[PDB]
């Protein structure tokens, strides 16, 4: 249905004034397609999906030069932030940045994002109108004011509504077989005895794409989150995802409990029951 | 593709 392109950037300083590590990754939907790691040998943007490999040298050289400039910028930023927060050069600090765009089913722009965190906390973000900024702390106001005065948002807005979507469309087309697929979950339930008279029921969803999924338990048709365990959706390692949900029930009452699976690849939601 | 401009905070 809807699709996204996102880039994630992490710059990490080590104590002692050494040079930071910088990692960039790019995603289309739930599929990674490029990387840059400052630790690695190449010092180049690298492919991580088959459909991007066909891009030519001007791509790779261009993405490399831009990402190195991203890196260089963040190296400076880490220093600047230490100043803004009146921090010593004793610790390790982190800058994170994410930006990208969403499109609708019609592949038209829907939404854009451009935001930063410092040491794990929101620092500054472009608001949804792509014309204004949000910065919670005092320290970040300086940045907001610089960027406001230099009309940075206007330039980001043109990328996010424009260029970004164009790239996303290109990747969706070139990576159609991978990206435009839906893999419905393969499901099953397990049962193990617990204590003297209880049992764990576990509802499994495997080999699905995209990652968005809903698993829920009902007791006699009543939704239940109590005594329920839901794990984070996790990568299988092969481009699909996994998830499970479990409940602990008294033995003999297993058949009161139903697991409900919702996913885009499913014509109808699924119900599972232990027998 | 990524941004083709950069700016310091």
């Amino acid at each position, epitope marked *: 249905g809807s699709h996204s392109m996102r880039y994630f950037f992490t710059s990490v300083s080590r104590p002692g004034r050494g040079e930071p590590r910088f990692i960039a990754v790019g995603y289309v939907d739930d599929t990674q397609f490029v990387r840059f790691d400052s630790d690695a040998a190449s010092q180049r943007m690298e492919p991580r999906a088959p459909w991007i490999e066909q891009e030519g040298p001007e791509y790779w050289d261009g993405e490399t030069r831009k990402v*190195k*400039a991203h890196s260089q*910028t963040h190296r400076v930023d880490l220093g600047t932030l230490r100043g803004y927060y009146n921090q010593s050069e004793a610790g390790s600090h982190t800058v994170q940045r994410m930006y990208g765009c969403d499109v609708g089913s019609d592949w038209r722009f829907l939404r854009g994002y451009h935001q930063y965190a410092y040491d794990g906390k929101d620092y500054i973000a472009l608001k949804e109108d792509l014309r204004s900024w949000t910065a919670a702390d005092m320290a970040a106001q300086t940045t907001k004011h*610089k960027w406001e005065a230099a009309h940075v948002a206007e*330039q980001l*807005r043109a990328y996010l509504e424009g260029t970004c979507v164009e790239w996303l469309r290109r990747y969706l087309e070139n990576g159609k077989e991978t990206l435009q697929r839906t893999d419905a979950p393969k499901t099953h339930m397990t049962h193990h005895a617990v204590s003297d008279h209880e049992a764990t029921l576990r509802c499994w969803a495997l080999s699905f794409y995209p990652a968005e999924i809903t698993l829920t338990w009902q007791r006699d048709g009543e939704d239940q989150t109590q005594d329920t365990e839901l794990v984070e959706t996790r990568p299988a390692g092969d481009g699909t995802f996994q998830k499970w949900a479990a409940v602990v029930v008294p033995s003999g009452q297993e058949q009161r409990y139903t697991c409900h699976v919702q996913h885009e690849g499913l014509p109808k939601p699924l119900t599972l029951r232990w027998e | 593709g990524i941004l*083709g401009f950069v700016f310091t905070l």
Partner: T-cell receptor
Amino acid sequence: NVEQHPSTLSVQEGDSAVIKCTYSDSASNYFPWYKQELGKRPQLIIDIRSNVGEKKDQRIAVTLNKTAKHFSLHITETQPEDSAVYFCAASFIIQGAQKLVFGQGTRLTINP
Amino acid sequence: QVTQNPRYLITVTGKKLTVTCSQNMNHEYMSWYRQDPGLGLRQIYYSMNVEVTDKGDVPEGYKVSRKEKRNFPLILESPSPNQTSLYFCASSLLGGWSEAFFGQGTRLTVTE
């Protein structure tokens, strides 16, 4: 590379002057013009960003074609005080930084 | 303002000199340029912030320092006749994006 020609231009008082710059990098996104009076320092007089095709400030304006990668300073109804060296710049990524790269300059003379 | 000194300078070849540049504008970015006939404004060195320095397009024969925000001196360890020029310091709120505020200029002649 940012190229600014001609090196010199003479225009009659009251007529218009146009100075054009070309640039190499299609990602360039900021284009300022600096005025330098004889013996004095350069000073920004007007600028434009790539999301805009023309920007004006009364008698003066800048026009941009980001596809063809050129832009121009327009000075209408020139006055004697418009006599100066004018420098254009384009901003783009060079050596890991967003940088203003200046053209070679154009010496404008407003003749009586 | 941006405060650049001296306005005029003579040195013999080989004798170390320093050109000063001070600003009290609440700007993190500073840079040095050389202005020569026909060549425009060429960047010598720039500094994105305190204790950060990076070469420009013509760094040879020059050094700088940025131990604090307000100052960005230009050092010529061994001045050469080909370093005879008009030097400009500039500062900016955001390099590559905003107005460059220039100093008054230093006119240096290196003599044999």
